[PDB]
């Protein structure tokens, strides 16, 4: 179950199918740089608490590295190293001039005050500033970090520099150089990939039977988005149960009666199980709940033409192979959710020029990137007769392998 060694296997199988040699795996199986730091913080009670921080930079062969920072009690070195590698793949799937980066601090932010989080954000930037910046390694928001933390981190970096460096970090508030169209960008990308998968199977959304798992932020918005496309949303589900209407659920009713924590099954008596919801006959199954939802146990039972992953990691390895050889078009999470990294990149470009796009322009620019990435992965999947996940990994890693070779590193 170890993430990092599992991530290495992803890189190894993709470099190996691309035809690169053992030397190339050895170069890419670990970050080029990993910086571990100890950040003293003056806490609100006057004691100094010392926090462990990490910043991984996987490969900068293609450009500066990119990836967010998370504040979690369970952050580890192996976690940060693995996710920096996943960032490399995410950037390449959508063709950014970026290698993968990642940072983490071991702390419980929910147990710290405003002033403590700011002082820890500043001390983090102080601790790593020698290897980061607009041209080296660009952090961004992640678990338990948000625009205010990006704003403190930017101010600290810019004071050290003696000038404004908004391109240091992405996810900034608008007034600090943030990018319009940033909040919806991941979900909008799932919307493009859904509509692009539908064309590949010549499935008209209007009247198509679609079931989505989950009814929180991702699931609310995806059930509403397909209901307004005229599609029939015959199933939605909760942590507590699921709903099924062969004629299509009244999404606007559920939407109205849901509570602020993504639950709505609870109001209802007639209720079906999540496991039965996944096995419903439908055109588009969209898992938007949680991981390991389609497994070797139900992979032969799901009868959807298209499965777009909105949750992270909802299909297991053996289930992915079972789905592809049943003809099902599986769009992997690492492609479906690439809208967030793409708009991070747009923010950094705006900071480089000093000129800022309108929302309609970011959307236009965001749409083509997704439309183009989907086609790159789909074409690699079908040309090489592989599942779209491995094809996505291959598209994800090949720029870094090509650049590493050209620059003389292998």
Ligand X SMILES: NC(=O)c1ccc[n+]([C@@H]2O[C@H](COP(=O)([O-])OP(=O)(O)OC[C@H]3O[C@@H](n4cnc5c(N)ncnc54)[C@H](O)[C@@H]3O)[C@@H](O)[C@H]2O)c1
User: Which residues define the annotated binding site for substrate?
Assistant: 66, 90, 344
Residue among 146 and 379 whose Cβ is closer to a copy of itself = 146
Question: Does position 17 bind a copy of itself by CB under 8 A?
Answer: no
The footprint of ligand X on residues 336-365 (CB under 6 A) is: 337
* 230 phi-psi bin (left φ>0, alpha ψ -120 to 50, beta other): left
**What is the closest distance, in whole angstroms, from the C-beta atom of residue 285 to ligand X in the complex?**
13
Q: Pattern 152-171, binding to a copy of itself, x per CB under 8 A?
A: x-xx------xxxxx-----
Residue 283 touches which of ligand X, a copy of itself, none (CB < 5 to 8 A by kind)? none
**What is the closest distance, in whole angstroms, from the C-beta atom of residue 145 to ligand X in the complex?**
12
The footprint of a copy of itself on residues 69-88 (CB under 8 A) is: 73-74
Question: Does position 256 bind a copy of itself by CB under 8 A?
Answer: yes
Say how far apart CA 255 and CA 286 lie, in whole Å.
17
**Overall size of the chain counted in residues:** 410
Stretch that binds a copy of itself, among 9-17, 140-148, 294-302, 335-343 (CB under 8 A): 140-148
Q: Which residues are annotated as a binding site for NAD(+)?
A: 70, 141-142, 186, 215-219, 238-239, 260, 262, 274, 289, 312
Question: Does position 310 bind ligand X by CB under 6 A?
Answer: yes
Residue 312 touches which of ligand X, a copy of itself, none (CB < 5 to 8 A by kind)? ligand X
**What is the closest distance, in whole angstroms, from the C-beta atom of residue 163 to ligand X in the complex?**
33
**What is the closest distance, in whole angstroms, from the C-beta atom of residue 274 to a copy of itself in the complex?**
9
Closest CA to 92 of 368, 336, 342, 371: 342
Question: Does position 217 bind ligand X by CB under 6 A?
Answer: yes
Residue among 8 and 274 whose Cβ is closer to a copy of itself = 274
Residue among 7 and 351 whose Cβ is closer to ligand X = 7
Residue among 202 and 260 whose Cβ is closer to ligand X = 260
Say how far apart CA 399 and CA 61 lie, in whole Å.
9
Say how far apart CA 48 and CA 42 lie, in whole Å.
5
The 3 state secondary structure assigned to the chain is CCHHHHHHHHHHHHHHHHCCCHHHHHHHCCCCEEEEEEEEEECCCCCEEEEEEEEEECCCCCCCEECCEEEECCCCHHHHHHHHHHHHHHHHHCCCCCEEEEEEEECCHHHCCHHHHHHHHHHHHHHHHHHCECCCEECCCCCCCCHHHHHHHHHHHHHHHCCCCHHHCCCCCHHHCCCCCCCCHHHHHHHHHHHHHHHHCCCCCCCCEEEEECCCHHHHHHHHHHHHCCCEEEEEECCCCEEECCCCCCHHHHHHHCECCCECHHHCCCCECHHHHHCCEEEEEEECCCCCCECCCCCCCCEEEEEECCCCCCECHHHHHHHHCCCCEEECHHHHCCHHHHHHHHHHHHHHHCCCCCHHHHHHHHHHHHHHHHHHHHHHHHHCCCCHHHHHHHHHHHHHHHHHHHCCCC
Stretch that binds a copy of itself, among 35-43, 131-139, 298-306, 335-343 (CB under 8 A): 131-139
Stretch that binds ligand X, among 52-60, 149-157, 185-193, 194-202 (CB under 6 A): 185-193
The footprint of a copy of itself on residues 175-204 (CB under 8 A) is: 175-177, 183
Stretch that binds ligand X, among 6-14, 128-136, 210-218, 364-372 (CB under 6 A): 210-218
Q: Which residues are annotated as a binding site?
A: 66, 70, 90, 141-142, 186, 215-219, 238-239, 260, 262, 274, 289, 312, 344
Edge-to-edge strand list for the sheet holding 281-287:
242-244, 232-237, 209-213, 281-287, 303-308, 329-331
Residue 218 touches which of ligand X, a copy of itself, none (CB < 5 to 8 A by kind)? ligand X
Catalytically annotated residues: 102
Strands 65-66 and 48-57: unpaired
The footprint of a copy of itself on residues 298-337 (CB under 8 A) is: none
Question: Does position 289 bind ligand X by CB under 6 A?
Answer: yes
Residue 287 touches which of ligand X, a copy of itself, none (CB < 5 to 8 A by kind)? none
Stretch that binds ligand X, among 43-51, 90-98, 287-295, 318-326 (CB under 6 A): 287-295
Question: What does the binding site for ligand X look like in residue numbers (CB under 6 A)?
Answer: 110, 186-187, 190, 213-219, 237-239, 260, 262-263, 274, 288-290, 310-312, 337
């Amino acid at each position: 179950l170890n993430l990092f060694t599992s991530t290495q296997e992803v890189v190894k199988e993709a470099l190996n199918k691309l035809g690169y040699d053992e030397a190339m795996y050895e170069l890419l199986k670990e970050p080029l740089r990993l910086l571990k730091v100890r950040i003293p913080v003056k806490m609100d009670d006057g004691t100094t608490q010392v926090f462990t921080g990490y910043r991984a930079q996987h490969s900068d062969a293609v450009g500066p590295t990119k990836g967010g920072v998370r504040f979690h009690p369970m952050v580890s070195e192996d976690e940060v190293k693995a996710l920096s590698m996943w960032m490399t793949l995410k950037c390449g799937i959508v063709d950014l001039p970026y290698g993968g980066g990642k940072g983490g601090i071991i702390c419980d932010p929910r147990q710290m005050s405003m002033g403590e989080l700011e002082r820890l954000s500043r001390g983090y930037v102080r601790a790593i500033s020698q290897i980061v910046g607009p041209t080296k390694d660009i952090p961004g928001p992640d678990m338990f970090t948000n625009a205010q933390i990006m704003a403190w981190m930017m101010d600290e970096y810019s004071r050290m520099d003696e000038f404004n460096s908004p391109g240091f970090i992405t996810g900034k508030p608008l007034v600090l150089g943030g990018s319009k169209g940033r909040d919806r960008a991941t979900a909008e990308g799932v919307t493009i990939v859904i509509q692009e998968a539908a064309k590949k199977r010549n499935i008209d959304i209007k009247g198509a039977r679609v079931v989505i798992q989950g009814f929180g932020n991702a699931g609310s918005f995806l059930a509403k988005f397909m209901s307004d496309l005229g599609a029939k949303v015959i199933g939605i589900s909760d942590a507590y149960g699921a709903l099924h209407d062969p004629n299509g659920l009244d999404i606007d009713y559920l939407l109205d009666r849901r509570d602020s924590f993504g639950t709505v099954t609870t109001l209802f008596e007639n209720t079906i199980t999540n496991q039965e919801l996944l096995e419903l006959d439908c055109d588009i199954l969209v898992p938007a709940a949680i991981e390991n939802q389609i497994t070797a146990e139900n992979a032969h039972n799901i009868k959807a033409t298209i499965v777009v992953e909105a949750a992270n990691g909802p299909t297991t390895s053996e289930a992915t192979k079972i789905l592809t050889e049943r003809g099902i078009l599986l769009v992997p999470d690492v492609l479906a959710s690439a809208g967030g990294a793409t708009v991070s990149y747009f923010e950094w470009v705006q900071n480089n020029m000093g000129y800022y796009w309108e929302e309609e322009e970011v959307q236009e620019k965001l749409y083509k990137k997704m439309y183009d990435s989907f086609e790159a992965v789909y074409t690699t999947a079908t040309t090489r007769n592989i599942d779209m996940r491995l094809a996505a990994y291959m598209v994800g890693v090949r720029r870094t392998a090509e650049a590493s070779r050209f620059r003389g590193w292998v």
